[PDB]
């Protein structure tokens, strides 16, 4: 009894989410004001490092 | 001479891929082109103390100093998220508590010994930047910026 | 039979892109409907084992949770008005052995033949 | 009760029909499968005795 | 006769190129061909594969911003033309 | 079941080379360009 | 006429007597084509729709020898046949080695369409 | 006994089809043909459990009878009940035979 | 005369050339390998014992 | 293009290529059909080439066809079938007295010429709900596409249909 699942909870399966992904949901939920440089950002979104 | 184990295996880095490079400096000179449009921009250029070839100052604004009662993975660089706007960190490695939850860009500069042997780094950096050579950050930024 | 279960294991996997699997007749089939929903990037029978690709988004896989309903020791069967009361009200995929070929859940229904449930996907309770 | 009883003969001769082409046509395709691989066992089979 | 549609590619080259191409069927290879007006990229084959990984941030950005992303797989032409002065003899 | 016909990586390998009389497997380095 | 020529000297004119039988009671009387199979060869993998309907049921019919049949000598490892037993004593009579041995070897894959076969 | 709502699921119509045959025939393998005319045909039945959800074997051996003695031991057969009784044991008459085992 | 159906014949024909050869040469290599094995000592095993891998720790519990 | 000026501009080449490549391919395939039926020195370059890629031996160069002087316009004469003829042979199918089409044409291709067909650009549906949203979703029968139109577009792109087709003609030819 205790870690005996391999194929389960072991392996973690959380989302990786991106400071552009993070910020959008905030301000939409009125927790924080937009920043100058939110914009900056969203035309050029970074680059995925977790697929290379 | 050397008495231990002889590796066998040998494992490849794609993310520092020589044609890899090509997109990331396209990708990340856009970045920088919109935001130094806008009036009233502030960076960080965080380091380390073994960089002797990079001048620090005196003084560090949101350095906060705490004691070792009740610091239980303390966040020192909380407050570098209203006077700043873009930190570009040196060694992710050292700096990788701090920064998992930081609501600031990070244009983290590691090498790929590090990158495979701690993948961790890669959730908390934002725009990955190559390195050429990967053996000292302090000598590495000096000849970019002073290129020609 | 037995090596249909056997493929769970080797899917089911987060930091991987590609794992190997056991040779199969049924194992084939059963890849062909995985793909159309989208939940498997490819695979490719590379002779006595076949080697089957792993799709990622955001970091986790597309594959979360596999439930395992057949087995070789029994044999689980539902007349078409009684699947409708197990499955409902959920995104789900359950793979349905009919007599003509295999289908998925959904098409089932649609047909109103006897089907048999052999493995969950992406389900939860 | 006659205008029902006959109702309901010409459906069933009508399923009969349906069901007995489905099934022959099901069963020649399969014997097919099984004849032309039996086949290519046979003939391979001898080639590997000389 | 050419079919699939060849003639309309090559009536739209510059100046009467696609009749001595297509009478004599002189070859073209390297640089010449996006220098010549057939093509209009030169992106590497090592971009194909690297695309499949990095797809999920175009459902991001708006419908225009999706092209500007594709922008930076292209490079740059080299100088280099064979038919730089025997152009004008055709 | 050894006279089974079955598709494995190295039949088709052997297929491809019968064609060519007596076009053999290549590969290919990484394009190192300094321009870029 | 292949004792005869063996008898003699003529050792490579002698074998294709031998295959010439072999293949005659084996691929029916449709032996004159000698080439390999016109991708008729049913039974493999994903096989292509076009060939199976340039074929009738003169294509399901088996060879072997008068009394047995082929699929007779698959389930009997003891049963045999003519045909097969003068077309053996050839390869060991002029040995293994034999360069008119080793091309009517190779020959017979070709001719019967299983060559590569893994 | 099952329950109404025991006889509409799956598993029960399922176990009941293959039970089920033309007649209520039966099929099993002959056993022992020592007697004359008499042969005990081994007959496999299945049966279903609502607790577990899974189906067992349990073998049912009868006797049956046989004009020509045809049938041979280890040889699969087709039986047929009989409205009588007829015999000691016999209790069940011959139709065809599908399988024969050489001698 | 036929222009097509000629077109087959000489397709069909140089196709089995090419057959023939290449599986004479796969049988002549086939054979040498195997020959020289078995005209050679056996090699005796010298290298460490297998004195680790007896026991092992398979999946804890049920 | 980013500017609206920009913008405008693409919209004129996109239009004029448009109709170029309507233009080119309706005359390509007129001189296609012609061709195949009355040159009859393009069955010798067919088979020189065909022979010649297995080894450069069994190519041979054929002597064609003297040079004749031609009108150049026979070539890309309008072709259609039509009933109609109450106006002394209006069409008499391609041309007054060109090769003509079997009948069995009739079924897919109304007419010869090479015409557009209004491909849809959205998905299809079947519950109520979702044909609603379809832009091409007519409230006069409740479907999102015409049943007797698309019958006919899944016959033509079939392949199990077509080989049986080219085989019986394949036997025909062989046998007579």
């Known amino acids: 009894k205790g870690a005996v699942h391999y194929t389960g909870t072991n392996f973690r399966r959380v989302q990786r989410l991106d400071i552009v992904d993070r910020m959008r949901a905030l301000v939409a939920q009125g927790l924080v004001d937009a920043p100058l440089w939110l914009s900056a950002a969203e035309r050029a979104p970074p680059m995925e490092l977790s697929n290379l | 001479m050397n008495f231990n184990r002889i590796p066998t295996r040998l494992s490849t880095h794609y993310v520092c891929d020589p044609y890899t490079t090509l997109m990331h400096y396209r990708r990340t000179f856009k970045f920088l082109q919109a935001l130094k449009a806008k009036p009233n921009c502030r960076a960080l250029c965080l380091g380390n103390k073994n960089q002797v070839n990079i001048s620090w100052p005196k003084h560090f604004d949101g350095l906060t100093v705490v004691t070792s009662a009740v610091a239980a993975q303390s966040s020192i660089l909380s407050s570098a998220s209203v006077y700043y706007s873009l930190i570009i960190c040196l060694d992710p490695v050292l700096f990788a508590k701090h920064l998992y939850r930081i609501n600031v860009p990070v244009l983290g500069v590691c090498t790929p010994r590090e990158i495979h042997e701690h993948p961790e780094i890669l959730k908390v950096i934002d725009y990955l930047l190559p390195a050429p050579c990967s053996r000292t950050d302090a000598a590495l930024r000096q000849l970019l910026q002073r290129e020609f | 039979m037995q090596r249909a279960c056997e493929m769970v294991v080797s899917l089911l996997r987060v930091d991987a892109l590609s794992q190997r699997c056991p040779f199969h007749v049924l194992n084939v089939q059963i890849l062909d409907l995985l793909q159309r929903e989208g939940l498997i990037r490819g695979f490719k029978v590379d002779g006595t084992k076949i080697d089957i690709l792993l799709k990622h988004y955001k970091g986790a896989p597309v594959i979360r949770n596999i439930r395992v309903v057949s087995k070789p020791s029994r044999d689980i069967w539902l007349t078409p008005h009684e699947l409708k009361f197990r499955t409902r009200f959920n995104t789900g995929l359950w793979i349905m052995q009919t007599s003509c070929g295999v289908i998925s859940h959904r098409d089932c229904l649609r047909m109103g033949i006897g089907g048999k449930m052999l493995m969950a996907i992406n389900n939860g309770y | ?50 | 006769i050419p079919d699939s549609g060849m003639s309309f590619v090559l009536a739209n080259l510059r100046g009467s190129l696609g009749v001595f191409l297509a009478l004599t069927g002189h070859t073209l290879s390297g640089p010449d061909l996006i220098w010549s007006g057939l093509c209009k990229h030169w992106i590497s084959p090592e971009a194909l594969p690297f695309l499949e990984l990095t797809a999920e941030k175009q459902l991001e950005v708006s419908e225009r911003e999706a092209a500007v992303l594709l922008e930076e797989h292209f490079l740059d032409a080299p100088d280099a033309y064979s038919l730089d002065d025997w152009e004008e003899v055709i | 079941k050894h006279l089974d016909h079955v598709p494995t990586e190295r039949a088709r390998q052997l297929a491809e080379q019968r064609s060519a009389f007596e076009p053999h497997l290549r590969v290919k380095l990484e394009k190192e360009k300094f321009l870029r | 006429k292949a004792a005869r020529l063996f008898h003699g000297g003529a050792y490579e004119e002698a074998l294709k007597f031998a295959v010439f039988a072999y293949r005659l009671e084996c691929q029916g009387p449709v032996e004159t084509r000698r080439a390999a199979a016109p991708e008729h060869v049913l039974g493999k993998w994903r096989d292509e729709e076009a060939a199976l309907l340039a074929v009738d049921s003169s294509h399901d019919k088996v060879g072997g020898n008068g009394t047995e049949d082929l699929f007779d000598q698959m389930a009997c490892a003891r049963a045999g046949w003519p045909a097969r037993t003068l077309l053996m004593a050839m390869y060991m009579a002029l040995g293994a080695k034999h360069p008119a041995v080793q091309r009517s070897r190779a020959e017979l894959e070709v001719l019967l369409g299983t060559d590569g076969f893994v | 006994h099952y329950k109404t709502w025991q006889r509409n699921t799956a598993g029960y119509l399922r176990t009941f089809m293959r039970n089920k045959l033309p007649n209520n025939e039966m099929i099993g393998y002959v056993i022992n043909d020592k007697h004359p005319k008499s042969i005990r045909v081994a007959c496999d039945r299945f049966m279903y459990v609502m607790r577990y959800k899974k189906t067992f074997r349990y073998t049912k051996k009868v006797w049956a009878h046989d004009e020509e003695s045809e049938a041979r031991l280890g040889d699969v057969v087709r039986i047929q009940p009989l409205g009588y009784r007829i015999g000691p044991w016999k209790n069940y008459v011959l139709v065809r035979v599908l399988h024969k085992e050489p001698r | 005369e036929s222009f097509f159906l000629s077109l087959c014949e000489l397709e069909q024909k140089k196709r089995t050339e090419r057959a023939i050869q290449h599986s004479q040469d796969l049988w002549k290599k086939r054979t040498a390998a195997k020959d020289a094995h078995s005209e050679k000592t056996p090699e005796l095993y010298d290298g460490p014992f297998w004195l680790k891998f007896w026991r092992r720790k398979k999946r804890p519990g049920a | 293009p980013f500017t609206l000026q920009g913008d405008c501009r693409k919209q004129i080449l996109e239009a004029v290529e448009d109709r170029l490549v309507q233009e080119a391919l309706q005359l390509e395939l007129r001189a296609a059909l012609r061709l195949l039926a009355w040159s009859t020195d393009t069955i010798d370059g067919l088979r020189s080439e065909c022979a010649g890629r297995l080894n450069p031996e069994y190519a041979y160069r054929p002597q064609w066809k003297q040079s004749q002087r031609f009108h150049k316009e026979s070539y890309l004469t309008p072709l259609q079938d039509f009933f109609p003829t109450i106006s002394s042979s209006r069409d008499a199918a391609s041309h007054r007295a060109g090769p003509h089409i079997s009948p069995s044409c009739a079924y897919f291709f109304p007419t010869p010429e090479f015409t557009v067909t209004p491909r849809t650009f959205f998905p299809l549906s079947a519950h109520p709900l979702i044909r609603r949203i379809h832009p091409d979703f007519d409230e006069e029968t409740g479907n999102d596409h015409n049943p007797y139109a698309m019958h006919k577009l899944q016959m033509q792109w079939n392949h199990s249909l077509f080989i049986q087709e080219r085989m019986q003609a394949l036997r025909h030819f062989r046998n007579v």
């Open chain 4, 1 to 50: 009760l006659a205008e029902v009883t006959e109702e309901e003969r010409q459906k069933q001769l009508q399923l009969y029909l349906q069901e007995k082409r489905e099934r022959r046509l099901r069963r020649e395709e399969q014997l097919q499968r099984i004849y032309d691989d039996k086949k290519r066992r046979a003939v391979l089979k001898d080639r590997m005795r000389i």
